[PDB]
């Protein structure tokens, strides 16, 4: 299960945050700052995997805004990257040419999509079209 997911920009600003572990607000902020510093202080050939606090911190940013995850040391490492890619593809399909500008303004939509896709740190829908259809149906409810 993913302990936490933090979508941070290249400049260090965070556009998304979703932690599945109940932590203090100050502790959560410190952890986010440390993760941003570690990711921002890493090269492009670091394997996209960091063992921070005994957590397989996987970073894979496909644009200026980066992505982060906190997977426990009990599952495969490529699974987190595959899940991140699937989530990015689903968000792009739901939004349509998703960019950094739409993420900040449409943070509620991204949060709803993440909730409908991953709940409690585990995957909820393996397919990419069923989740999109469910999100569209929920949005069309009003």
């Amino acid at each position: 299960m993913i302990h936490f997911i933090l979508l941070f920009s290249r400049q260090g600003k965070l556009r998304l945050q979703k932690w599945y572990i109940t932590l203090p607000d100050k502790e959560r902020k410190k952890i986010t700052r440390e993760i941003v510093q570690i990711i921002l202080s890493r090269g492009h050939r670091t394997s996209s995997f960091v063992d921070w606090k005994e957590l397989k911190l996987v970073y894979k940013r496909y644009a200026s805004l980066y992505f982060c995850c906190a997977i426990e040391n009990q599952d495969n490492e490529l699974l987190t990257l595959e899940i991140v890619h699937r989530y990015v593809e689903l968000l792009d399909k739901y939004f349509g040419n998703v960019c950094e500008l739409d993420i900040i303004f449409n943070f509620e939509k991204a949060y709803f999509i993440l909730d409908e896709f991953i709940i409690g740190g585990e995957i909820q829908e393996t397919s990419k079209k069923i989740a999109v259809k469910a999100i569209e149906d929920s949005d069309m409810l009003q």
């Binding site: 920009s9 496909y62 644009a63 200026s64 805004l65 792009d92 040419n97 998703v98 960019c99 500008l101």
Partner: peptide, 10 residues
Amino acid sequence: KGENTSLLHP
């Protein structure tokens, strides 16, 4: 800018 670019460009 660098923000208007698509995350995956699909």
